[model samples]
Target chain A: DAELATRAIPELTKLLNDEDQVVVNKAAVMVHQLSKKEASRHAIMRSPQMVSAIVRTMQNTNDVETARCTAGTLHNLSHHREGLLAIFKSGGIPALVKMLGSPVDSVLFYAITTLHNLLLHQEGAKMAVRLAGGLQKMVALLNKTNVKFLAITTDCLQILAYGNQESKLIILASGGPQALVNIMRTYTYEKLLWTTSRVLKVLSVCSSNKPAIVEAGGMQALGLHLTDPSQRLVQNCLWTLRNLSDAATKQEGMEGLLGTLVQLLGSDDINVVTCAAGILSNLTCNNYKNKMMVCQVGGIEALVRTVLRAGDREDITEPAICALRHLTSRHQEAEMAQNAVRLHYGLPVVVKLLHPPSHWPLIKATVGLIRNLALCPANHAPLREQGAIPRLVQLLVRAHQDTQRRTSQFVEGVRMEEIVEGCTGALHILARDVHNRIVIRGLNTIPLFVQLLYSPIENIQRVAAGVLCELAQDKEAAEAIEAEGATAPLTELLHSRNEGVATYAAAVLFRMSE
Target chain B: KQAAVNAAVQRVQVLPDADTLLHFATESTSSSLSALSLDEPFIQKDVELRIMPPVQ
Candidate 1:
């Protein structure tokens, strides 16, 4: 069989460029059929010579059927790196983008199909596709559809949206979000809903699309489809819902959605596990009620395992840790969840992320979690033992990488505001413990706090002033505070009106004047 | 009934929201604090204040 195919491939491929239409169509059909199997696909594509000949045939042929058949062969070959790039380099993308305007529906469908397959395997080619105006026309093609067109067009829009921020914005403004949701509502096929959910999942990251998705009833549809869907489709839907949850405040049916997400955490599929983790992260972001439900359904241990199992996995670990941070913060139901994270010995991993060369979002989430964990006295000694105070003090001096690009005034001011808020909030919570109090005295962080006090913003100043109140609880810290010249800011606040600032300022002055 | 109405009115104590009062009170020199006023009646008292005495 192998020898015969090897012998047959050249005979068929040689006829690809023949002047006869029947020869060209037969060769293209055989090549497309061969591409359906992995072995034959690679075997046939092994000859760059044959591939170039076929590409020439597609381009040179005036016959629409022959060109359409060759496009089909290209689609079959589009899954692998070699085939994907080969198709693009052989002029398939430009040809396909141009062919999308064909009057025949079959040509249009096959053209879109070839583009989608090419886009899936080639990340670089997406920019090419977009420049060729493939996205705009692809969006227009969504205006009409069949079973074939629906499948191809859904993936086309999804991949296009997944391209970049500019691409997402382009598609969003083109009514792609509402259009896909309309398709979702109008169709009963599993494939369309699955593909549409993928588009919505990636689109949900842009906050501007949130209201449109809600308006389109997309979230409600996603919630309904989560019941009894396949794992792949369910994961995509969950991802969409997770991103939507932040802005979808107070919608009904969320209680049941939380239950479904909890049930998914136990899945063997890593993507499902990670997506469920992400969903829980966004759901618990600020909602205490959802936090309670996650905790009740063994969510705490699952979240901890999500972090530990996904060790150093930025995608899963960041949201997982963020969920723990929210779950443990200022909630009566979070006691069990907080205990689970510490008991699981997950503290060291989070502490390590505070060191250099880690992602800033991860660091931001890690600091927030430590802030809440320190609220429990039980974690203070361990938190200090883990060198939390020094790590946090060090983080105060660092800026996120996003802030490093622009040296302009506004970026610097925004960067400073973010860093001050995160660092001071953590330190403020950590200073609640006496052990941490003693640890704080040796760190020489007084200058940082003093600089914070003199900041232009009142709230930033108030956090520094509040930390001083706690540190002034110790006599030596009080003496250290005075030596740092904290008295000036405190005195200024004595004649001020902002209740919290003036109160903290007076309290710090009260302690220092003693 | 009249007494209850008077008590309810007395219970409605208010100050400027946080930002306005903060600006009036802290974001200025002493003259701004002196010049600050409200259209409504107010409660005021002045207590003697002191800087820190020597640490005894």
Candidate 2:
């Protein structure tokens, strides 16, 4: 049958150009059928003139049946690279874009399907479709209510909007965000929901579309899907929600979503946990009542559990640690959040991240959270009990050395200085405990603090002197401080204009002389 | 004398919240830390007293 079909290619091409409309339609249908088979498609495309004749028939046809068949034939040809190149070289994209305006459902389906196929393969085809107004035509299709029509149309739109910012903006300008949110609320079909969620995910990357999405009740709708059985659908919805501003999250009823976000932190999927933590980070930023609410609902425990369960992934650890930092940041709830972190054994995990082979952001966030936890006096003994001091001292020494060597580089030096500052700040808080002071002395950290007194950075000098001041309260540490030759620098710091520097320096000297 | 040192330690023990710490980390100074007040003459005399022994 294939051999016979192959022989019919010449005659079919002959009849495709016939002056009679009836014969042309029949030949187009036959060619459409032949193009469906891979071997037969190869035979049909053997003659370069045959593809041009088919494209011409598609462009010049007045009959709906003939147009549908030609478009469908190109749809079939677009499956392979060779046939796609042939159809594209024959001006197929513009022709397909033109078919998008057809009143016939079959013709539009073929056109959209073919464009989706072509757009997925060639980058130039997306630009071509955009220039041909295919993007606008597709956005117009979102208004259609037919289930199958919206399904394929949104699938094509998803492809159009994937990583293409211009197309996303155009879709946004054409009311795509509200339309997609409406579909998300109305549709129960899994594929339609997934595809629409993906489009919104890409669209939300554009800052202008964020408020519009929220205006359309996107948060409520997306929150409803958080417990969906499909992990990918939940992830996409969470990603979209993550890009929303804190004000938007606060304006929406965040209380209802808090419990679910906490639950999602316990999910086995790393991506789901990541976005869940990210949304929590956004929602709890500087919002005291929400932080209290999250803790009241065991949000801290869930986040701590996430960190304890997270082995070494920077992605998961960073956002979870960041959210923990925010939750523990407020004055009203700092003790409560610190207690939750302690009860969940979160200190060691945080301490583990302070060492090298970890990213700077994670280090920075981890140290920030540690500093916050140290704010509560009750957590200090537990923090030191968890072996936090030695690791923190190790981080301080390494960061200080790096800071001295990399003073010429601006950004890198600032990052190292932050770690140094964080470590020093945490140590300053920890040194208030009598046991922690002995640990600091035992670590032989006096000489290091003496060296830090000479740092060009004023904050470093301030915190360094503050720690030494605390350590000098002990007789052994005071002798060690003088032995390390810290007196001259301490004398110089006594005249520092920064009261923090001068006062702490004076205090350390006062203790050393006692 | 121990009371003065305790007051000093108490004043220095006032740690900033995490938000302020992050701000200071990036901007290298914070409004809260800058707004702190100290008894200047007392601390100045205290420094002069401490400076003599170290210089000698």
Candidate 3:
């Protein structure tokens, strides 16, 4: 076909440039038909004049048939890299954007589709579309009553907005969010809803667009589709809501929405569970009322079920653990939340995440929750029985090394120091019990504790010295602390600037001498 | 002496909250939006055209 189509190209190019519009239209139709074949595409694109002729015919033609066929030919050519380059180099984007205003549906269809293909394969084509005023035109097409046209238009908008921050802002300013929510409310066509919801999801990635979307009733629109039988649509809606939760939670009527999200936590789909957990995590952040409401709705139990059921599925378990971590971290409901986790056997699940190969965030949240659970004395024995002491020790050793290696790389938030601090903090609390003190000594963590006493990080030094103070209560454990060469650090810490460090050091020295 | 140690340990600040983990979870999952394929228009087969001479 390449060889066969090579012979036809010269005649088509001449006819495309003929004086008669009828001859040019016939030649354009033949080019459109020939370009559809993969073998003939390269053969036709070999001549720069051939591509230029098609672009000119599409742009300058007075007949709708000629415009449609010429744009169709460009759409077919936009499939491959060589053809995409040729059409783009021929200034095809501006011409296609101009064709978007054509009254004929087929012409509009071909133009929008060809632009979609161009923007998808070439990065600079996005800038070209924006320059051609295509973003505004694409947003205007969202109001089209035709479902097929609307679907392709929304799909084109999605391609324009994907990974391009400038385009997202432009679309948002063009009332893209409000237009999308309006369609979402009125449209029940599954494919249109799927495509529209996907564009909303991508648009919501821009922080500025989140409020605009929710302000336009996006939350209610998305909530209506939560029970859609189509899992893909539901997943898209869930992810969009997850992105919007930070803004959505601030509005009224969130309690019922919280209930729906909690229910989704038990969905059979792992993605549904992940998105649901993520939304809950955002909804409950720093809002005590939502946290308590989530607990009341059995959100805690549902999340526990997700963790227990999600063995080796870290994507599923990580967010669920994070939600549980937030739920258990509250001051007012700290004990209640901790007991709820313990009653549901969430202790071991969190401890299991402390194992190696777990991501740092998962480990950080898990250890923080462990420290909170230890705040309750009843949870201490079960935590110890579940081997929490040994896990915390192992995490501390690794975390210490991590801090040493990456003393520079750093979140507003969690760091290796915090992990070390949380581990030692939890260990400090657990060591109040005599058996846990013995367990720490048995795990050979006393040497690490002594090493931490000399830490440049003040919080680690304080917690490590505090743990030694507890371990010093037991005679053999005290001997183990003394044997690990802790005396020199302990004596030096007496004059430490931090009063806690100095007092804890004095306590350990006194306990050792006893 | 044990009382002093207990007092000192009690003064140790509570572990930081897990709010920052939300950022991590959100970021890790944010990249998971599956790439969508562009929807192409369905082009129909062309009907044969009869070009008649214009009547003068």
Candidate 4:
């Protein structure tokens, strides 16, 4: 066959220069078919005259067969980097794009397939937008029922979508997402699944496409492909899930989603772990059953490891912390889990993350976890034992300095609001333990303790007043209290709108007078 | 309370023709019907004739 095609290549190359239209068309078909053979692709490519002849044939759109075969040849040639650059430099993209709206389906199909292959290179994608109605024609072609054409058309749209936002807007406007989902529903073959998933993976990057994708069973469609052993398919599905999670609609058909995510948590790939954690974070937010299920599948421990494994990478740690915050939060009787995290190795690692070096957003989340853990009375002693109280007090006092520095500048800076708020709450809880209360009052923090009473933030004032009320208990604290002269401001806070502030202030004042 | 309201309505029941007094609405005039005319010259003869019959 190679020998036969080898003899025909020269003859075909010569025939392409023929003045006879039928001879030229026949020569183009032979060259296109010969290019399809892996052996002859190099032979055709090695012949510089063959490429020029093919490009000429593609430009001659008047002859439909010649146009189709030449476009098909370019499509095959595009699979290689060398041929890809050649097609664009020859101005073949603009020529083939004109055939996108060709009345003949074969010519149109070849044109789309060629563009799909060309889009593998950046230059091809940029030139694709130059074609008028090229995007619309591709979207219209998606309405075709031919499975092979539909697959190729989806590939073309995915590449077009990758071109720029304008292309994406057209596909979305032309009901591209719905068309893909329609293909998914009617045709569930592996190729369509792969191509449809690939197309949606690109489309879902736009938030506007999310609802349509979800409305079109996009979540379930992607979830179906999760069982495939292919890492690329799984990765694409995960990204689509992450994008869709931005919309707060029903994330239905998550039956096996938790297990797969948890399994991926063990993936040696950091990106795999990051995406899994992020999607879990979104899915579990304000959703109780999902949270509990995530934990039941060892998600909590996996996320803790993710944080520790991420070191200082906020991109990874942020989502891991976000998921953990939800896991240890409010419900599920996770008191033991909360305490376990407070003690042993977990609390120290968790406490060290509160300061500099770590991203402020990550620190905010870290503080939230500590706050949730601080909720359980039993965990307070361990948290204090882990030096949690001192770090919190340090932050609380430092935030006061920040609050002062910014006061003159009046510039809004990262004041570590989460640290202050979380610290205030942690101190309030730690105050329940009498010895802990004594240690806190000894820090000369008595003035800063009531400093928030003058703050515009009502919650801080309320929390500050509560701590002062607890601190002004006996003789040592009594002298410390009267020494700070908290009575004047404490009494003034009695008129505060926050009833808790008023109650706590009144309580502290009564103890001081006693 | 409902039973007491029903008892009160029964306890205050009065007017012998109240049950038969179905027309509890007003007509399109400012006059009323009486067995005898209250105008002085209207039924004075009837009254004298009735009295003379008694005298007779």
Candidate 5:
């Protein structure tokens, strides 16, 4: 197999080294793909001349493609330390950075990636950033950047952070967060995500630097990303939350902020859950208040459910234990809280969730919950002592991208911007609670059955009138939802305002009134 | 008679995908047969129909 792999290389390289113009060009492209493996990796790293030869090929190749191929090999060579150090000692960094100034797109792309890889080597990164005029170039590109340039800038921002905090501070202060936020929301695969967490993580790691960064919308952005549909985005969210957790406790709204994070720890992804538990442990650093806020968010019950779900799956057991360890470490609040389980409203759901090995991620999370429950002094000693701790110590860690290949409108299951138009203000609100006052019976699901007085959606306006028609007899539930922003939006739907809307709203109001 | 033949030719052209051919033999005899209608008239002329294979 190794021989076949090796044999394939030179044949491929011969094609790359062909004499005919088209064949030579094709060979360059094809040879660009040839892998060097471990042996070649060492050769490039050990021999200064080898790196120079590759760089020379990269520079001298008359064919557009041969240059690209050589550039790619050289890029890979930069991966290991000595190979990359050879690149540095020989002044390859400046040469690569200069390629960024090339007019050709392909040359620029390879140049960008080469710089990206070199930065991955840490210290070798700074020279590229500095030589390429990283800060100004990145800011300009951020404002008006092509996908290739944006991709490169993603790495540039990350590496720039390591050189000095001031360099990074300037990038963010020049509207870095806002630009990335837009790209994260809008661009398909510009690689905006490449730098978001690194910036946030680096900023968060330093204790004195958090408040300003948090105020700059760093933490809030990460929290918002948790709800993003992408799984990678969700993982990044957990990582950011963990970094944010290391901050001092006395900071205002810290518990509320952390509680929101613990709620996301319900994720089935092991790495995500493990990172989240690590965050919770970090937050529980000194404050008992952090413990109470986490409990309020139903952390105990969720962790217990996760652990119990993992059962005998050996892989998930370690993470289950890790998360439980975090939960149990904060015990002082055990005396303050009573019941924190919120997985399901009923005790039956609790027992069902606790049934072993049903689903491992859930078990790992559940184990954490059980640990927290045992820590709850108010839960009574017998239940606390009921052998939940040993069951959690068994799960393993799990870990996890979005590329911009599809339109968001297509993916989000919508088309034509006007369907949920700004003007209609139809504002459909959903909170799935049986007892929710927004929309319920006598209220016809919306509390204020008779009084949707102000919606712009013709139907909602009419439906608002219909709410009264429903509440014609029953008033209690109808009045509840009406109080919560329904009045005006609904009024837009009022009185034959929209026939279908009026029909349903009036019908509900009528039932309530009768 | 010529009109009939022309119409038939037109139909064949219009419906090329439909496979059929008509043969008319001996115009003088065909005329003689046309004149004898209901009564008994024996004629040398005749019209025949046949099917053809599909076009390539």
Candidate 6:
């Protein structure tokens, strides 16, 4: 195997100068790709000669594409101190960093990728910061003044968020956090929003330092993102907020942020409703104000209404119920609880969400709502008797993720994107503290979704699995999940179908399994 | 094939009938939708059958 890699290089290297470039270029690219693998990387790291060859090739201007590939290989090679030290010893960092200022976007791509790869290695990260001015260089390239570098700069900040806390802080201090959140504010592309969200997730973890974020000002800004018309944006914002709240070390900060979260409840966006509920499972505290704050923002009632209308997460649903139960534990809480039960509270608008043909979210929110309703305090029996319990239980067994046994029974339908979008926010009127508990009862609700695994209409299993995953924060109650089977099947669902399934499955799974 | 294509162009399912073909959209989830008027569209049926499955 090693010998084949060794033999392939020389022949491919000769093809670099061939007159017909595409075929040769393809071969060269393949060789570089294969060499980028771990075995080849370690192999090249062991050989200084290989590193030097790569550095020399990068210096050649005419073979720009090949040069980029060479830089990529050298970047891979420089992952170890031996490989990286060899590159620096060969004067590679200065050359690579210098490429950032050049007009060649292609070279810059390779240059940035190589340097980023190098930074993955400890010595490379230090040298990158020291010699290449990693944060400064990336920031300078992305600033408003350098509009040419915007796309690449955006991509780089997205990537850099995953490396190290110190580097992330350097990036944040250099204005990466503000710029990135701002970019995400306008980024409507669902994948791009989540991608930026992922980078923010990493920054939350890796930042050695953080500035206090807010509700009156900062949360309102985030709530705008959280309430974006785009479902994906709403999802991504909720995801990031979930992580931020879960990562909060201060009770004051967590309690303070609830104001904007509560306002988002009225957004009339179901994704916002569901995502807000999902986010709420983590924003809890022993402090009376922290506990009472959900009430102040119109707590139990908003959650009840959202649960009435929202869909697709039992993880979020359970916390919503717990918060309701916590609020309802007191006399005023019971008073608010009764209003939702009477259905005059508009909570009954969710009755439209009960049928099999309900939006996929309806399945999730329904199953989750059922689970939450199941937790309705005994003192609220007057409300439960009004029909919340039995209706939910009947639906619970047939929840979306559990549809394998229930699917194929229905057919013939139309598409109502506008209606779906319009109906999505029916309960935003009640969404405050969507991130009440990002990790409800210790469960991740996102990944354990089995509806994600098999493609049998995609809803039943998602509803069931998502609910269990939401309740996952409490390790003891997951027996229902274990009795059901390995939630891994749901995660497997994600690999084939829509990314949201995979994302929710992954989110639910890791969090639930934890 | 022609009839099926006609049914598609008109965006309905056509079953052969006594004289005129009958075209309609039924609820995949609840039979309650068969009574649904085809003057415009079947809203819930459309979302359940076409939209939610793929998106979820």
lDDT of 3 at A254: 69
Local error of candidate 6 at A128, Å?
Answer: 5.4
Q: Candidate 6: misplaced stretches above 4 Å?
A: A1-91, A98-133, A145-148, A185-195, A206-218, A227-232, A246-274, A281-302, A305-314, A325-514, B1-56
Docking class of 6: incorrect
Candidates' TM-scores?
A: 0.56, 0.73, 0.69, 0.69, 0.37, 0.38
Interface RMSD of each: 33.9, 32.7, 11.9, 51.2, 50.1, 33.0
Clashes of 3: 0
Worst ten in a row by lDDT for model 6 chain A: A424-433
Best by lDDT: 3
lDDT of 6 by residue, A183-217 (tens): 55565444445445555555544424223332212
For each candidate in the order shown, give its overall lDDT on alpha carbons: 0.67, 0.76, 0.78, 0.67, 0.46, 0.46
lDDT of 5 by residue, A76-183 (tens): 554455656777776677667655555565565556655665665446457556655656555545654465556556656666665366765666656665665555
Q: Model 1, range A1-514, lDDT digits (tens) per residue?
A: 3665778777876687676777787788778667666668777666666677677776666777666667666655654557766777776677778777767665675567557656655656787888877777776677675744676677777766763677777777888777877776677667777777877877887768776787777776776666655765676777777667666644544676777777776776777777677767766756667778778877777777667677667767877777778788656686676676788787777677776556766777787787777666777778778877888887775542233444343442245466666777778778878878777767877877876776667767766777787787677788888998888878887675666677667666666655
TM-score per model for chain B alone?
A: 0.22, 0.25, 0.23, 0.23, 0.22, 0.18
What TM value does chain A in model 1 reach?
A: 0.60
For candidate 1, what is the lDDT? 0.67
Model 3: residues with Cα > 4 Å off, grouped in runs: A1-128, A141-148, A204-221, A241-253, A356-361, A397-419, A441-447, A469-514, B1-15, B22-56
- Between candidates 2 and 4, the DockQ winner: 2
Per-residue lDDT tens digits for candidate 3, residues A339-441, read 9888987878778888866777677778777877787788889998888888888878887898777756554345778788989988998887777877888
In candidate 2, stretches whose alpha carbon ends up further than 4 angstroms from where it belongs are A1-90, A102-107, A120-124, A163-165, A201-221, A238-252, A278-290, A352-364, A402-415, A469-514, B1-14, B17-56
DockQ of each: 0.01, 0.02, 0.10, 0.00, 0.00, 0.01
Better of 1 and 4 by TM-score: 4
Q: How high a TM-score does candidate 3 get?
A: 0.69
Q: How well does candidate 2 score on lDDT at residue A401?
A: 88
Q: lDDT-based ranking, best first?
A: 3, 2, 1, 4, 6, 5
Query: Candidate 4, chain A: TM-score?
Result: 0.75
